[model samples]
Target: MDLADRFAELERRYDARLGVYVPATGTTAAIEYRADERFAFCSTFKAPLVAAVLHQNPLTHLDKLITYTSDDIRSISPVAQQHVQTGMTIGQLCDAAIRYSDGTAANLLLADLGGPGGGTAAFTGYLRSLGDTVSRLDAEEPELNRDPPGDERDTTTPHAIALVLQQLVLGNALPPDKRALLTDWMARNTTGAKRIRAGFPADWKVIDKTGTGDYGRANDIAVVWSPTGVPYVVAVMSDRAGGGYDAEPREALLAEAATCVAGVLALEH
Candidate 1:
């Protein structure tokens, strides 16, 4: 079967809503499955948020140190909680947000950009500048994870987010140096080891991010490179009809979806 049929099979087997988008790069044509459908962005928004910060001022902003008090800390802040007393540099915050999915670190960085209100506008503005019309963030951290049915806040389509990742990683979304920084951080991401990355060959390079939220939402997006050097951008997002945010099994679904995408991309080269 082709990509769409394969994805449909996965959805039926898992009894979940699945969306995928593998943007065209080099000779491979775009491959999509429910690619335009909207789902909660969850922690996935942190990747682009970091990209926007780099776009603002890659050099000085990275080195600038910002201090935070105990009140600033939030749940799931493994990295930020440890450094509340000593403060963290902008670069460190970016690392925590992208690599560790540190909520407080993300909020602190968002505050730096402009608190939740202004920050949401700024982040959405950055996406707009990138020509992304389908993705938007309306709140911060935990609140953003409140993805109720039919609510569009903090949501994105697989296609939109994949396009944004492609631009940031392979297009001219950021300066080459700054782009390298973002990609390096993503490449080192520890959150997606079992999702998209699990589907690729041991040696293939994958730069990715993962997100989880209410309603069984589990997502992974990546720029994967074939061993021979061809590159592809892919996003796999899933959500079941009813459940809390338990991603263990949904992660396997993402991995399977990614495996299919990898096989199709391999055929291109």
Candidate 2:
């Protein structure tokens, strides 16, 4: 099928909004239907959070020990909770949050970073240093409403997030080393395998993360291989909670769509 045909078929078969961008040549295509007028970023928000933690903890005192209390162990940033051990260097926690998606680790990192450490900063310092001033990540949502708030509580356009993930793949967001680190961490992520991971081959490497709350389902953004370029980033947001993440048939539906996208990208990979 042609690109349009395949995408339409995907639309018919699965319920999602897809945003795509090619890095090598900067070619792009994004279909933003009714996906996220303002969907929760879910775990995907961890990207910037990870960036913030990395930027703030400069390892000036490399010997400083960051403690891992039971409270830190209770966090839900995914990799933060399990992969990071107690008494690790701040650098290691940052690495775990990026690679494993650990929730506790994310919290510890965030606590150390000052974003969630009672400071009302907007990750401004990090963004400024990186020559990025467009996006801001500071809403100051309280713990009662939600311990881990979505990337945005209100609204987001596909144009924005699509650019965000694409830049990471293009190595445009962070310095070469940091950008490389994000890509590397993404490659190591096995979370959301049901939705996006199932879309690609068991062996084909895909760096993917999904998010959704308030709405029934959430979003999926990932970078997988392409033959003609470095990789292509696919950002999808769906509106199915029960059927998407449930063991019955939710993730299967999403995975099928992901698989189709991978099939198309594989031709080029």
* Cα lDDT computed for each candidate against the true fold: 0.86, 0.53
The count of residue-pair clashes in candidate 1 stands at: 0
Deviation of model 2 at 48, angstroms: 2.5
Least well predicted 10-residue stretch by lDDT in candidate 2:
140-149
Measure candidate 2: CA RMSD. Answer: 5.2
**Per-residue accuracy of model 2 over 1-269 as CA lDDT, tens digit each:** 56556656654665544333223334434434333344444446556666666445453532456766555464355444443454666666656655655655555555666745543244435544555444344433222113222344423444455556666566566567666766777777666667777777765667766554432445667777654444666666555432433312235555755666666556544
Off by over 4 Å in 1: 244-249
Clashing pairs in 1: none
